[PDB]
Design a protein around this motif. Structure first.
Motif, PDB file in Angstrom:
ATOM      1  N   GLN A  56      -5.789 -21.636   1.886  1.00  0.00           N
ATOM      2  CA  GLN A  56      -6.155 -20.316   1.398  1.00  0.00           C
ATOM      3  C   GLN A  56      -4.931 -19.666   0.755  1.00  0.00           C
ATOM      4  OE1 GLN A  56      -7.846 -17.854   4.489  1.00  0.00           O
ATOM      5  NE2 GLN A  56      -8.585 -16.266   3.087  1.00  0.00           N
ATOM      6  N   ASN A  57      -5.181 -18.754  -0.187  1.00  0.00           N
ATOM      7  CA  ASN A  57      -4.118 -18.089  -0.928  1.00  0.00           C
ATOM      8  C   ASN A  57      -3.259 -17.224  -0.007  1.00  0.00           C
ATOM      9  OD1 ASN A  57      -4.770 -19.096  -3.557  1.00  0.00           O
ATOM     10  ND2 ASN A  57      -6.485 -17.649  -3.640  1.00  0.00           N
ATOM     11  N   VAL A  58      -2.022 -16.997  -0.439  1.00  0.00           N
ATOM     12  CA  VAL A  58      -0.995 -16.409   0.416  1.00  0.00           C
ATOM     13  C   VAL A  58      -1.235 -14.911   0.547  1.00  0.00           C
ATOM     14  CG1 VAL A  58       1.465 -16.019   0.723  1.00  0.00           C
ATOM     15  CG2 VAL A  58       0.648 -18.191  -0.227  1.00  0.00           C
ATOM     16  N   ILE A  59      -1.428 -14.453   1.779  1.00  0.00           N
ATOM     17  CA  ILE A  59      -1.508 -13.027   2.065  1.00  0.00           C
ATOM     18  C   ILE A  59      -0.090 -12.487   2.189  1.00  0.00           C
ATOM     19  CG2 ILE A  59      -2.222 -11.306   3.767  1.00  0.00           C
ATOM     20  CD1 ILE A  59      -4.163 -14.551   3.670  1.00  0.00           C
ATOM     21  N   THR A  60       0.215 -11.442   1.428  1.00  0.00           N
ATOM     22  CA  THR A  60       1.550 -10.864   1.384  1.00  0.00           C
ATOM     23  C   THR A  60       1.516  -9.448   1.941  1.00  0.00           C
ATOM     24  OG1 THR A  60       1.253 -10.052  -0.878  1.00  0.00           O
ATOM     25  CG2 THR A  60       2.163 -12.265  -0.602  1.00  0.00           C
ATOM     26  N   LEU A  61       2.392  -9.175   2.905  1.00  0.00           N
ATOM     27  CA  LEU A  61       2.553  -7.840   3.472  1.00  0.00           C
ATOM     28  C   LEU A  61       3.846  -7.249   2.924  1.00  0.00           C
ATOM     29  CD1 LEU A  61       0.479  -9.176   5.652  1.00  0.00           C
ATOM     30  CD2 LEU A  61       1.461  -7.482   7.212  1.00  0.00           C
ATOM     31  N   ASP A  62       3.716  -6.239   2.066  1.00  0.00           N
ATOM     32  CA  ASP A  62       4.865  -5.633   1.407  1.00  0.00           C
ATOM     33  C   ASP A  62       5.481  -4.515   2.243  1.00  0.00           C
ATOM     34  OD1 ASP A  62       4.676  -7.316  -0.809  1.00  0.00           O
ATOM     35  OD2 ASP A  62       3.276  -5.976  -1.841  1.00  0.00           O
ATOM     36  N   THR A  63       4.655  -3.614   2.762  1.00  0.00           N
ATOM     37  CA  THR A  63       5.107  -2.455   3.521  1.00  0.00           C
ATOM     38  C   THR A  63       4.434  -2.448   4.893  1.00  0.00           C
ATOM     39  OG1 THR A  63       3.405  -1.036   2.538  1.00  0.00           O
ATOM     40  CG2 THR A  63       5.551  -1.114   1.425  1.00  0.00           C
ATOM     41  N   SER A  64       4.604  -1.340   5.612  1.00  0.00           N
ATOM     42  CA  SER A  64       3.930  -1.155   6.886  1.00  0.00           C
ATOM     43  C   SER A  64       2.431  -0.969   6.673  1.00  0.00           C
ATOM     44  CB  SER A  64       4.508   0.047   7.632  1.00  0.00           C
ATOM     45  OG  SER A  64       5.863  -0.175   7.982  1.00  0.00           O
ATOM     46  N   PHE A  65       1.665  -1.250   7.723  1.00  0.00           N
ATOM     47  CA  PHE A  65       0.212  -1.255   7.617  1.00  0.00           C
ATOM     48  C   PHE A  65      -0.332   0.169   7.568  1.00  0.00           C
ATOM     49  CE2 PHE A  65      -0.873  -0.134  12.023  1.00  0.00           C
ATOM     50  CZ  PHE A  65       0.288  -0.457  12.703  1.00  0.00           C
ATOM     51  N   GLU A  66      -1.272   0.395   6.655  1.00  0.00           N
ATOM     52  CA  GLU A  66      -1.973   1.661   6.508  1.00  0.00           C
ATOM     53  C   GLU A  66      -3.363   1.612   7.135  1.00  0.00           C
ATOM     54  OE1 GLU A  66      -0.467   4.326   5.201  1.00  0.00           O
ATOM     55  OE2 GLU A  66      -2.213   5.653   5.281  1.00  0.00           O
ATOM     56  N   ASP A  67      -3.841   0.400   7.463  1.00  0.00           N
ATOM     57  CA  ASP A  67      -5.226   0.090   7.850  1.00  0.00           C
ATOM     58  C   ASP A  67      -6.208   0.507   6.751  1.00  0.00           C
ATOM     59  OD1 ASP A  67      -7.290  -0.974   9.314  1.00  0.00           O
ATOM     60  OD2 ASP A  67      -7.178   0.449  10.980  1.00  0.00           O
ATOM     61  N   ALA A  68      -5.749   0.457   5.500  1.00  0.00           N
ATOM     62  CA  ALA A  68      -6.580   0.628   4.316  1.00  0.00           C
ATOM     63  C   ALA A  68      -6.492  -0.570   3.385  1.00  0.00           C
ATOM     64  CB  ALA A  68      -6.187   1.911   3.568  1.00  0.00           C
ATOM     65  N   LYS A  69      -5.280  -1.054   3.113  1.00  0.00           N
ATOM     66  CA  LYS A  69      -5.052  -2.223   2.274  1.00  0.00           C
ATOM     67  C   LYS A  69      -4.808  -3.491   3.080  1.00  0.00           C
ATOM     68  CE  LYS A  69      -3.098   0.329  -1.647  1.00  0.00           C
ATOM     69  NZ  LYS A  69      -1.913   0.507  -2.531  1.00  0.00           N
ATOM     70  N   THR A  70      -4.103  -3.382   4.211  1.00  0.00           N
ATOM     71  CA  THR A  70      -3.871  -4.546   5.058  1.00  0.00           C
ATOM     72  C   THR A  70      -5.143  -4.979   5.773  1.00  0.00           C
ATOM     73  OG1 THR A  70      -3.186  -3.165   6.922  1.00  0.00           O
ATOM     74  CG2 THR A  70      -1.482  -3.867   5.371  1.00  0.00           C
ATOM     75  N   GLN A  71      -6.063  -4.039   6.010  1.00  0.00           N
ATOM     76  CA  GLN A  71      -7.358  -4.380   6.590  1.00  0.00           C
ATOM     77  C   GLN A  71      -8.168  -5.258   5.646  1.00  0.00           C
ATOM     78  OE1 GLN A  71      -9.707  -0.959   7.626  1.00  0.00           O
ATOM     79  NE2 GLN A  71     -11.303  -2.159   8.651  1.00  0.00           N
ATOM     80  N   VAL A  72      -8.096  -4.977   4.342  1.00  0.00           N
ATOM     81  CA  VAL A  72      -8.787  -5.796   3.352  1.00  0.00           C
ATOM     82  C   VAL A  72      -8.151  -7.181   3.272  1.00  0.00           C
ATOM     83  CG1 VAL A  72      -9.481  -5.901   0.912  1.00  0.00           C
ATOM     84  CG2 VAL A  72      -9.439  -3.707   2.118  1.00  0.00           C
ATOM     85  N   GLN A  73      -6.824  -7.251   3.416  1.00  0.00           N
ATOM     86  CA  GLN A  73      -6.138  -8.539   3.435  1.00  0.00           C
ATOM     87  C   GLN A  73      -6.484  -9.349   4.678  1.00  0.00           C
ATOM     88  OE1 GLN A  73      -4.213  -9.818   0.928  1.00  0.00           O
ATOM     89  NE2 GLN A  73      -4.806  -8.014  -0.270  1.00  0.00           N
ATOM     90  N   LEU A  74      -6.725  -8.683   5.809  1.00  0.00           N
ATOM     91  CA  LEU A  74      -7.173  -9.407   6.994  1.00  0.00           C
ATOM     92  C   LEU A  74      -8.638  -9.810   6.887  1.00  0.00           C
ATOM     93  CD1 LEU A  74      -5.370  -7.409   9.815  1.00  0.00           C
ATOM     94  CD2 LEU A  74      -4.795  -9.674   8.931  1.00  0.00           C
ATOM     95  N   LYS A  75      -9.446  -9.039   6.153  1.00  0.00           N
ATOM     96  CA  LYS A  75     -10.836  -9.424   5.932  1.00  0.00           C
ATOM     97  C   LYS A  75     -10.968 -10.584   4.955  1.00  0.00           C
ATOM     98  CE  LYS A  75     -12.985  -4.949   6.970  1.00  0.00           C
ATOM     99  NZ  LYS A  75     -13.769  -3.809   6.419  1.00  0.00           N
ATOM    100  N   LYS A  76      -9.956 -10.824   4.117  1.00  0.00           N
ATOM    101  CA  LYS A  76      -9.973 -11.992   3.244  1.00  0.00           C
ATOM    102  C   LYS A  76      -9.753 -13.288   4.011  1.00  0.00           C
ATOM    103  CE  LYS A  76      -8.390  -9.638  -0.960  1.00  0.00           C
ATOM    104  NZ  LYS A  76      -7.317  -9.561  -1.990  1.00  0.00           N
ATOM    105  N   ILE A  77      -9.183 -13.215   5.209  1.00  0.00           N
ATOM    106  CA  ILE A  77      -8.905 -14.403   6.008  1.00  0.00           C
ATOM    107  C   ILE A  77     -10.206 -14.908   6.616  1.00  0.00           C
ATOM    108  CG2 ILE A  77      -7.658 -15.326   7.975  1.00  0.00           C
ATOM    109  CD1 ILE A  77      -5.574 -13.076   7.463  1.00  0.00           C
ATOM    110  N   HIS A  78     -10.591 -16.134   6.255  1.00  0.00           N
ATOM    111  CA  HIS A  78     -11.750 -16.777   6.863  1.00  0.00           C
ATOM    112  C   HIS A  78     -11.472 -18.241   7.180  1.00  0.00           C
ATOM    113  CE1 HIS A  78     -12.213 -17.756   2.586  1.00  0.00           C
ATOM    114  NE2 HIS A  78     -12.901 -18.811   2.984  1.00  0.00           N
TER     115      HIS A  78
END
Ligand code: NAG
Ligand code: NAG
Lengths: 50, 50
Positions: free
Chosen positions: B4-26
């Protein structure tokens, strides 16, 4: 302007743990957009440069 | 390898954008590369999001 304001304590006596809101202040510095400047308009990129 | 494509965490979690990145993980195996308390926060957010 933001919440959860923490401070780096006196690290020489009884404080060996690092400042936990480091990436918070880093995210403030990365998102710091400006329109002021004598030399010119300064704005941090994704690497934190001019 | 079915990578699967690389999930990148740039900053601290907002639970707005990082939540979508965790939902991409399957996928099955999640490879995490961070510090200790960041791993604690990521596992706590993954437990909170199932
Ligand atoms: C501030 O810190 C507290 C305790 O860690 C946390 O519960 C709260 O969600 C934080 N504030 C925001 C707006 O995230
Ligand atoms: C470069 O110089 C021009 C002179 O008019 C100035 O308007 C501009 O803001 C400068 N560029 C930056 C953004 O530093």
């Amino acid at each position: 302007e933001k919440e959860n304001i923490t401070d780096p304590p006196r690290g020489c006596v009884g404080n060996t743990n690092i400042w936990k809101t480091g990436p918070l202040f880093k995210r403030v510095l990365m998102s710091s957009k400006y329109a002021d400047g004598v030399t010119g308009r300064v704005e941090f990129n994704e690497d934190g440069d001019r | 390898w079915d990578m699967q494509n690389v999930i990148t965490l740039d900053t601290s979690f907002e639970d707005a954008k990082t939540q979508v990145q965790l939902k991409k993980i399957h996928s099955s195996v999640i490879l995490l590369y961070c510090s200790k308390d960041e791993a604690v926060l990521i596992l706590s957010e993954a437990r909170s999001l199932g």
